[PDB]
Enzyme design. Structure first.
Site, PDB file in Angstrom:
ATOM      1  N   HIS A 218     -28.044   9.227  10.542  1.00  0.00           N
ATOM      2  CA  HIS A 218     -27.903   8.085   9.641  1.00  0.00           C
ATOM      3  C   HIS A 218     -26.614   8.156   8.843  1.00  0.00           C
ATOM      4  O   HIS A 218     -25.906   7.149   8.728  1.00  0.00           O
ATOM      5  CB  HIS A 218     -29.101   8.035   8.679  1.00  0.00           C
TER       6      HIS A 218
ATOM      7  N   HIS B 284     -21.342   6.868   7.886  1.00  0.00           N
ATOM      8  CA  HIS B 284     -22.637   6.580   8.496  1.00  0.00           C
ATOM      9  C   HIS B 284     -22.424   6.115   9.923  1.00  0.00           C
ATOM     10  O   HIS B 284     -22.051   4.955  10.155  1.00  0.00           O
ATOM     11  CB  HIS B 284     -23.378   5.511   7.704  1.00  0.00           C
TER      12      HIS B 284
ATOM     13  N   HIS C 290     -41.196  -9.363 -24.131  1.00  0.00           N
ATOM     14  CA  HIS C 290     -40.339 -10.499 -23.842  1.00  0.00           C
ATOM     15  C   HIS C 290     -39.032 -10.501 -24.628  1.00  0.00           C
ATOM     16  O   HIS C 290     -38.150 -11.296 -24.307  1.00  0.00           O
ATOM     17  CB  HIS C 290     -41.106 -11.803 -24.125  1.00  0.00           C
TER      18      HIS C 290
ATOM     19  N   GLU D 196     -36.608 -13.414 -10.027  1.00  0.00           N
ATOM     20  CA  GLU D 196     -35.305 -13.336 -10.684  1.00  0.00           C
ATOM     21  C   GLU D 196     -34.281 -12.608  -9.836  1.00  0.00           C
ATOM     22  O   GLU D 196     -33.107 -13.001  -9.789  1.00  0.00           O
ATOM     23  CB  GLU D 196     -35.385 -12.671 -12.057  1.00  0.00           C
TER      24      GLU D 196
HETATM   25  C1  LIG Z   1     -40.828 -10.959 -14.944  1.00  0.00           C
HETATM   26  C2  LIG Z   1     -41.267 -12.234 -15.609  1.00  0.00           C
HETATM   27  N1  LIG Z   1     -40.605 -13.360 -15.332  1.00  0.00           N
HETATM   28  C3  LIG Z   1     -40.925 -14.516 -15.923  1.00  0.00           C
HETATM   29  C4  LIG Z   1     -41.948 -14.574 -16.826  1.00  0.00           C
HETATM   30  C5  LIG Z   1     -42.228 -15.960 -17.547  1.00  0.00           C
HETATM   31  N2  LIG Z   1     -43.593 -16.449 -17.279  1.00  0.00           N
HETATM   32  C6  LIG Z   1     -44.670 -16.265 -18.141  1.00  0.00           C
HETATM   33  C7  LIG Z   1     -44.659 -16.165 -19.566  1.00  0.00           C
HETATM   34  O1  LIG Z   1     -43.497 -15.525 -20.086  1.00  0.00           O
HETATM   35  C8  LIG Z   1     -45.897 -15.534 -20.181  1.00  0.00           C
HETATM   36  O2  LIG Z   1     -45.914 -14.173 -19.810  1.00  0.00           O
HETATM   37  C9  LIG Z   1     -44.548 -17.709 -20.114  1.00  0.00           C
HETATM   38  O3  LIG Z   1     -45.816 -18.324 -20.017  1.00  0.00           O
HETATM   39  C10 LIG Z   1     -44.055 -17.901 -21.568  1.00  0.00           C
HETATM   40  O4  LIG Z   1     -45.046 -17.451 -22.471  1.00  0.00           O
HETATM   41  C11 LIG Z   1     -43.728 -19.376 -21.833  1.00  0.00           C
HETATM   42  O5  LIG Z   1     -42.834 -19.840 -20.847  1.00  0.00           O
HETATM   43  C12 LIG Z   1     -43.105 -19.538 -23.213  1.00  0.00           C
HETATM   44  O6  LIG Z   1     -42.969 -20.924 -23.463  1.00  0.00           O
HETATM   45  P1  LIG Z   1     -42.042 -21.523 -24.624  1.00  0.00           P
HETATM   46  O7  LIG Z   1     -42.914 -22.249 -25.579  1.00  0.00           O
HETATM   47  O8  LIG Z   1     -41.339 -20.361 -25.275  1.00  0.00           O
HETATM   48  O9  LIG Z   1     -41.071 -22.449 -23.915  1.00  0.00           O
HETATM   49  S1  LIG Z   1     -46.102 -16.680 -17.266  1.00  0.00           S
HETATM   50  C13 LIG Z   1     -45.248 -17.172 -15.869  1.00  0.00           C
HETATM   51  C14 LIG Z   1     -45.871 -17.656 -14.579  1.00  0.00           C
HETATM   52  C15 LIG Z   1     -47.272 -18.203 -14.645  1.00  0.00           C
HETATM   53  O10 LIG Z   1     -47.711 -18.253 -13.297  1.00  0.00           O
HETATM   54  P2  LIG Z   1     -49.013 -17.456 -12.764  1.00  0.00           P
HETATM   55  O11 LIG Z   1     -49.450 -18.142 -11.550  1.00  0.00           O
HETATM   56  O12 LIG Z   1     -48.775 -16.001 -12.684  1.00  0.00           O
HETATM   57  O13 LIG Z   1     -50.047 -17.689 -13.968  1.00  0.00           O
HETATM   58  P3  LIG Z   1     -51.064 -18.914 -14.252  1.00  0.00           P
HETATM   59  O14 LIG Z   1     -52.097 -18.907 -13.201  1.00  0.00           O
HETATM   60  O15 LIG Z   1     -50.205 -20.233 -14.145  1.00  0.00           O
HETATM   61  O16 LIG Z   1     -51.463 -18.777 -15.675  1.00  0.00           O
HETATM   62  C16 LIG Z   1     -43.908 -16.949 -16.030  1.00  0.00           C
HETATM   63  C17 LIG Z   1     -42.847 -17.205 -14.971  1.00  0.00           C
HETATM   64  C18 LIG Z   1     -42.609 -13.347 -17.073  1.00  0.00           C
HETATM   65  N3  LIG Z   1     -43.642 -13.249 -17.971  1.00  0.00           N
HETATM   66  N4  LIG Z   1     -42.289 -12.209 -16.432  1.00  0.00           N
HETATM   67  C1  LIG Z   2     -30.797  -0.080  -3.615  1.00  0.00           C
HETATM   68  C2  LIG Z   2     -30.453   1.151  -2.823  1.00  0.00           C
HETATM   69  N1  LIG Z   2     -31.263   2.209  -2.903  1.00  0.00           N
HETATM   70  C3  LIG Z   2     -30.987   3.345  -2.254  1.00  0.00           C
HETATM   71  C4  LIG Z   2     -29.866   3.448  -1.482  1.00  0.00           C
HETATM   72  C5  LIG Z   2     -29.558   4.846  -0.798  1.00  0.00           C
HETATM   73  N2  LIG Z   2     -29.504   4.736   0.672  1.00  0.00           N
HETATM   74  C6  LIG Z   2     -28.326   4.598   1.400  1.00  0.00           C
HETATM   75  C7  LIG Z   2     -27.025   5.098   1.087  1.00  0.00           C
HETATM   76  O1  LIG Z   2     -26.741   5.120  -0.308  1.00  0.00           O
HETATM   77  C8  LIG Z   2     -25.878   4.425   1.823  1.00  0.00           C
HETATM   78  O2  LIG Z   2     -25.784   3.100   1.350  1.00  0.00           O
HETATM   79  C9  LIG Z   2     -27.048   6.683   1.519  1.00  0.00           C
HETATM   80  O3  LIG Z   2     -26.913   6.779   2.921  1.00  0.00           O
HETATM   81  C10 LIG Z   2     -25.968   7.594   0.889  1.00  0.00           C
HETATM   82  O4  LIG Z   2     -24.700   7.271   1.424  1.00  0.00           O
HETATM   83  C11 LIG Z   2     -26.293   9.070   1.151  1.00  0.00           C
HETATM   84  O5  LIG Z   2     -27.608   9.341   0.724  1.00  0.00           O
HETATM   85  C12 LIG Z   2     -25.313   9.966   0.407  1.00  0.00           C
HETATM   86  O6  LIG Z   2     -25.562  11.300   0.806  1.00  0.00           O
HETATM   87  P1  LIG Z   2     -25.010  12.576   0.008  1.00  0.00           P
HETATM   88  O7  LIG Z   2     -24.098  13.321   0.909  1.00  0.00           O
HETATM   89  O8  LIG Z   2     -24.298  12.061  -1.215  1.00  0.00           O
HETATM   90  O9  LIG Z   2     -26.246  13.381  -0.350  1.00  0.00           O
HETATM   91  S1  LIG Z   2     -28.771   4.154   3.011  1.00  0.00           S
HETATM   92  C13 LIG Z   2     -30.449   4.269   2.706  1.00  0.00           C
HETATM   93  C14 LIG Z   2     -31.549   3.964   3.699  1.00  0.00           C
HETATM   94  C15 LIG Z   2     -31.203   4.029   5.163  1.00  0.00           C
HETATM   95  O10 LIG Z   2     -32.280   3.385   5.824  1.00  0.00           O
HETATM   96  P2  LIG Z   2     -32.087   2.080   6.759  1.00  0.00           P
HETATM   97  O11 LIG Z   2     -33.241   2.038   7.654  1.00  0.00           O
HETATM   98  O12 LIG Z   2     -31.786   0.872   5.966  1.00  0.00           O
HETATM   99  O13 LIG Z   2     -30.747   2.454   7.557  1.00  0.00           O
HETATM  100  P3  LIG Z   2     -30.539   3.308   8.914  1.00  0.00           P
HETATM  101  O14 LIG Z   2     -31.140   2.553  10.029  1.00  0.00           O
HETATM  102  O15 LIG Z   2     -31.322   4.662   8.706  1.00  0.00           O
HETATM  103  O16 LIG Z   2     -29.096   3.650   8.953  1.00  0.00           O
HETATM  104  C16 LIG Z   2     -30.672   4.557   1.388  1.00  0.00           C
HETATM  105  C17 LIG Z   2     -32.043   4.671   0.739  1.00  0.00           C
HETATM  106  C18 LIG Z   2     -29.051   2.291  -1.438  1.00  0.00           C
HETATM  107  N3  LIG Z   2     -27.882   2.255  -0.720  1.00  0.00           N
HETATM  108  N4  LIG Z   2     -29.377   1.151  -2.072  1.00  0.00           N
END
Ligand SMILES: Cc1ncc(C[n+]2c([C@](O)(CO)[C@@H](O)[C@H](O)[C@H](O)COP(=O)(O)O)sc(CCOP(=O)(O)OP(=O)(O)O)c2C)c(N)n1
Ligand SMILES: Cc1ncc(C[n+]2c([C@](O)(CO)[C@@H](O)[C@H](O)[C@H](O)COP(=O)(O)O)sc(CCOP(=O)(O)OP(=O)(O)O)c2C)c(N)n1
Ligand SMILES: [Ca+2]
Ligand SMILES: [Ca+2]
Lengths: 675, 675
Positions: free
Chosen positions: B259, B25, B476, B413
């Site tokens: 690129h 690159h 979950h 996360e």
């Molecule tokens: C990608 C992802 N990450 C974390 C969560 C976890 N989470 C969730 C849950 O997993 C439910 O989906 C938990 O509520 C879960 O049910 C409890 O923690 C279980 O309690 P326990 O008795 O087992 O200890 S909700 C949550 C954030 C809540 O913030 P928000 O501002 O989105 O909702 P709100 O306005 O407070 O109701 C968050 C962070 C998720 N649902 N998805």
């Molecule tokens: C999480 C993630 N997603 C996609 C990429 C792929 N990607 C990348 C690469 O995988 C390299 O890390 C590719 O360049 C890869 O090497 C080629 O596609 C391979 O070509 P080929 O001959 O095998 O066909 S770079 C890239 C986006 C470039 O945009 P940027 O604006 O970040 O960089 P720039 O200013 O253009 O140099 C993107 C999107 C990554 N590195 N990481």
């Protein structure tokens, strides 16, 4: 008023559901009941026809608040009742603790993992815009529906929603209207501890329109006005800031304790009396609320009735488009569409499976209008765009049109995955795909898993599948990735070896109605195999080289099938007779009859697997496994294969060791088990 | 000038490296050479001591541009030479196609997967702030270093960078200075096709300071001034917008074609002549550039020499803190720290392993100052905060202090995972952790995999490990998650069954220096086991119940070990004698001696695995596998276990079937193989 009574009814149904389960989330339902009431009053939907293609869609992205959604569906007479609410969170019920589209009538998507639903809404809105551009004609607004999304602080913290919101703003998706539950409370307490950004300023930076409702605990007039305002802004998605009190009305309102645990019984009593309900009664549904909601349903049903007549008139005025639309709404692909799939013979040149994929797409996109797709900034590497097609862009940009078929997702794998789920959820037979490198499908695991749980026929075009990509090195080379997705229920993971297998993989992916597909494709060229066909590869696993007196069978996928064939020749010179099995999709294979599977992997012969990635899973199909269980390397791909002994001689050596290891032993198929 | 000659040297080294490999690159290296020159001139570092704890850190988040990084390291006399540059992208070289911290002197982290490096920079800066708050005293600026990050459009599109940037703004991380390569080109072409947001407005919304450099192709004075300006803003991270031309100088500058592919040979010739270099020469290093860069190195080495004297004086003035700091810089935990680990007996009460984890943290955090950690908005569910500790927050907020030990990551996360990698990368023996539900570790897979490849001793406190969580339901409940991470090289995946095993898991996680840990912990209570100990569980797998005349051995993990013990009693009544093996970490077990492993999983006896998730991987350790290969359900957890027959009777039935299946067969340990 009846509106006030409806809002109280919603609040109390949700609280009572949580109380009955002694589990779940009362806070956001209490805070969002006014907004839910107002939004559903503006929405067009038919409880008796959840699939009407011109319905407005609603998505609860803060899926833990689903007691609210279930209460709305019950009150509107969907196929969900108060008896179902009483079974909230109970095994086997239609009211699970987070919404599941497979289980819950009126749940468009599966939410609960934060951030997903808003992205799904972006995809529903993207599909609606593409669909309308494809079918609408003067005097024929076949598609003019909106996408309404509720989301909370947690969704706004998850990076996937930033990706989708940036893209939705770029795409000028004016029929998307999202509502932020601005209650300043998450599980860890005040948002002041972790989430102090200016959300509104961020959404303006994406090109969204903003409406703020400062008293969303009571001001349904302002919420309705915000929807009307959003509908006038046709070139920007809108975020409506709903400033609410979490747990509104509870003694514990405005606290993290009301987010996620049942209210105290005395709290529920005071809620009821303050709102004019009987504190001794649970699951009350005042008949005046039912009457008011029934009026809106009846009006919506008359709107759908008129839409049906519009569609009939459309079929007369636009016969070809009308028949195409009818076929899609019937869930049917074009008759004999698969005759467009390319077929190869062993006399044809070696081709990388990424390029074979390009060629398939080039042939089938013109034949199947419901195919759309894109890439996450890897179009010239994944080879996902058919030459001559137009990108999906707002025409105002000059870069495409909403009738376009190719989506520039940008470097946004996770949102691409969740947007694909939304496009599938829209319906109309959309068969949509998304390209990235296989190793970066992992960035989207949150959404991929939901494709499987939600039973959506989305497709990942996942190129650069292995160390065969070469110089980009171990940060790009999959090891664990196929094992991860194969271990997820309901994911077809195709790793085609050649041209015919790549066509079979696409046949499966496009015909799918309930199973997401990942197509693991190569950077490097592979030969056309003697013995492959679409017919045999469609079985998921098949005997490529039959050897009636086999000392060993080598089972392989993708780039390693040709390697196995070359190893068979080395083994012949060592006096060892091998057969070869190609296993392009383990899930499809598993679904074949027991007798078919045993014809491929019989008793009485040792079986060695060969695949240049993790050996996990392979003992389902083999006695010994030759895989790659360490990270890769940066170098020319053939040198990496040699380093790791993925050569004809290295495979033959391990095959000969396998034959020796089973000398004097009785061998039964890996398909046998004790239970 | 010499500065102009240095910039040309950097550009041409990078181009020549790509040319020699015929891979890689050249575009971003050409565009970012002025900025790299300017930043490295401002940075304090010692090429001969890459681990000086008060060095400024540099992170190339756009890791594909690594020919630029390697050129800087070579020019500054790190342990990387022009001969290494000539081996760019070649198997086994010190110049892989994306930077690897394990391989490349001066690469702080492993980049290439877009979005990660900026988040790693957030973590380096978080650690620096915590470290400085812990150790600095009046007249003793032990830690005062900066974190410089380069990033491109792709990093800004990836949602993980939004998460980390929101959090970094909240945390007021004023020693973080990031530089956006604003070149308006990604792989799919102009950013107008997919990335039209106002990035600067978004970064202002997070609370970042902005400096714009409109001619970053030439204006190194302005780049240096932007750094000086950023250093004056002590309460905000800074984003410097570097408006550059991708491929600056190339005939193909300003295009996507520059690129990611080598330049044409005639293009390289005209670059050389326009910049005063010999077009017939490659890998030129003008001695005046070496001299200028050596001056800066010599000055930096005098700064480190003075820092060493400051540290000696600090040890005299602050004896206790000085000894603690010395021990940490030596990479050593406190003597006998593990005596703080809780120990249990079978007479003690049943406890969920999430609560056992809380108790461990409560005991070890006061004893081991280099432990810090947090949760992704799940503190009261993961139980990750020790009572009485203070949160890591800027004191200006009133919500914590930079000396705090507990991080409120918010619902982020993926960024949490990448920030943890940055905290580890800072060094000083940091042993850092991050809590979420096991199923949502999957949101962070991009970073988790890099913890493994980078060999960082980070720890995920991954509670709610299974269907045992109950009512929150299948969105979950992990199924595939342990298989995914166990299939990744170099991840210790502990699933402790009880109190003693949980202490062993933490002993491993905290003592780790090169292996990330995931601790899969329960919501539900589990009994203390007869036969467990820290000593035996430290072996990763051990014989819990020895049965010299076993008809079967049941191998299990976590919540299923108690289930196996109960099944043993059911089997006794059926006339079947079972042993039980507990396998709390497969990786640790695999690393034990062959003889130890065979003592646990001997020849001559059928072995059944039991774990309420995917069966993938389990054939390493068992002949038959009882697992859960379908999604879960929303209901009370005991009812879900009963539904899926994860009961003493269901295990016993499958164990009896296993014994019958092997009647008359010769059985060898699953640990045996043919090669
Ligand atoms: C990608 C992802 N990450 C974390 C969560 C976890 N989470 C969730 C849950 O997993 C439910 O989906 C938990 O509520 C879960 O049910 C409890 O923690 C279980 O309690 P326990 O008795 O087992 O200890 S909700 C949550 C954030 C809540 O913030 P928000 O501002 O989105 O909702 P709100 O306005 O407070 O109701 C968050 C962070 C998720 N649902 N998805
Ligand atoms: C999480 C993630 N997603 C996609 C990429 C792929 N990607 C990348 C690469 O995988 C390299 O890390 C590719 O360049 C890869 O090497 C080629 O596609 C391979 O070509 P080929 O001959 O095998 O066909 S770079 C890239 C986006 C470039 O945009 P940027 O604006 O970040 O960089 P720039 O200013 O253009 O140099 C993107 C999107 C990554 N590195 N990481
Ligand atoms: Ca909230
Ligand atoms: Ca760029």
């Amino acid at each position: 008023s009846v509106d006030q009574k409806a809002i109280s009814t919603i609040r109390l149904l949700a609280v009572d559901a949580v109380a009955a389960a002694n589990s779940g989330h009362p806070g956001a339902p209490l805070g969002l009941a006014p907004a839910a009431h107002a939004v559903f009053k503006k929405m067009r939907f038919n409880p008796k026809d959840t699939k009407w293609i011109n319905r407005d869609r609603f998505v609860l992205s803060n899926g833990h608040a689903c007691a609210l959604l279930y209460s709305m569906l019950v009150l509107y007479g969907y196929d969900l009742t108060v008896e179902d609410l009483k079974k909230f969170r109970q095994l086997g019920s239609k009211t699970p603790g987070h919404p599941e589209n497979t289980d819950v009538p009126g749940a468009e998507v599966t939410t609960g993992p934060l951030g997903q639903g808003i992205c799904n809404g972006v995809g529903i809105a993207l599909a609606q815009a593409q669909f309308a551009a494809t079918y609408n004609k003067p005097d024929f607004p076949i598609s003019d529906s909106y996408t309404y999304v509720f989301l909370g602080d947690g969704c706004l913290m998850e990076g996937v929603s930033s990706e989708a919101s940036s893209l939705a703003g770029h795409l000028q998706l004016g029929n998307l209207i999202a509502f932020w539950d601005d209650n300043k409370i998450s599980i860890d307490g005040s948002t002041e501890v972790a989430f102090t950004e200016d959300v509104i300023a961020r959404y303006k930076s994406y090109g969204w329109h903003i409406v703020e409702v400062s008293d969303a605990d009571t001001d349904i007039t302002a919420i309705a006005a915000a929807i009307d305002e959003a509908k006038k802004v046709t070139n920007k998605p809108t975020l409506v800031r709903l400033t609410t009190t979490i747990g509104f009305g509870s003694l514990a309102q405005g606290t993290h304790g009301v987010h996620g645990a049942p209210l105290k019984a005395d709290d529920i009593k005071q809620l009821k009396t303050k709102w004019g309900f009987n504190p001794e009664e649970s699951f009350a549904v005042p008949a005046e609320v039912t009457a008011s909601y029934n009026e809106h349903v009846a009006e919506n049903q008359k709107i759908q009735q008129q839409w049906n007549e519009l569609f009939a008139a459309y079929k007369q005025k636009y016969p070809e488009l009308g028949a195409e639309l009818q076929r899609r709404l019937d869930g049917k692909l074009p008759e004999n569409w698969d005759k467009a799939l390319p077929v190869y013979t062993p006399a044809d040149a070696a081709v990388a499976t990424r390029k074979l994929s390009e060629i398939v797409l080039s042939k089938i996109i013109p034949e199947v209008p419901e195919i759309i797709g894109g890439s996450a900034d890897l179009t010239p590497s994944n080879l996902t765009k058919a030459k001559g097609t137009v990108d999906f862009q707002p025409a105002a940009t000059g870069l495409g049109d909403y009738s376009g078929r190719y989506i520039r997702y940008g470097v946004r794998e996770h949102a691409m995955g969740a947007i694909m789920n939304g496009i599938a959820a829209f319906g109309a037979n959309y068969k949509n795909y998304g390209g990235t490198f296989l190793n970066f499908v992992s960035y989207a695991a949150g959404a991929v898993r939901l494709s499987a749980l939600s039973e959506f026929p989305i497709t990942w075009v996942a190129t650069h599948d292995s160390i065969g990509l070469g110089e980009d090195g171990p940060t790009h080379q999959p090891i664990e990735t196929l094992a991860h997705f194969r271990a997820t229920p309901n994911i077809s993971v195709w790793r085609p070896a050649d041209g015919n297998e790549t066509s079979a993989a696409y046949k499966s992916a496009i015909e799918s109605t309930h199973t997401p597909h990942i197509l693991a494709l190569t950077r490097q060229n592979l030969p056309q195999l003697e013995g492959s066909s679409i017919e045999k590869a469609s079985k998921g696993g098949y005997t490529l080289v039959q050897q009636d007196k086999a000392d060993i069978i080598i089972v392989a996928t993708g780039s390693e099938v040709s390697l196995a064939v070359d190893a068979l020749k080395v083994l012949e010179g060592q006096g060892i007779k091998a057969g070869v099995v190609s296993l392009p999709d383990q899930l499809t294979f598993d679904k074949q009859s027991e007798e078919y599977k045993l014809s491929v992997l019989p008793d009485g012969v040792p079986i060695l697997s060969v695949e240049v990635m993790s050996t996990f899973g392979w003992s389902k199909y083999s006695h010994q496994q030759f895989g790659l269980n360490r990270f890769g390397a940066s170098g020319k791909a053939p040198e990496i294969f040699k380093l790791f002994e993925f050569t004809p001689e290295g495979v033959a050596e391990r095959a000969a060791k396998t034959v020796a290891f089973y000398k004097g032993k009785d061998v039964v198929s890996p398909l046998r088990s004790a239970f």
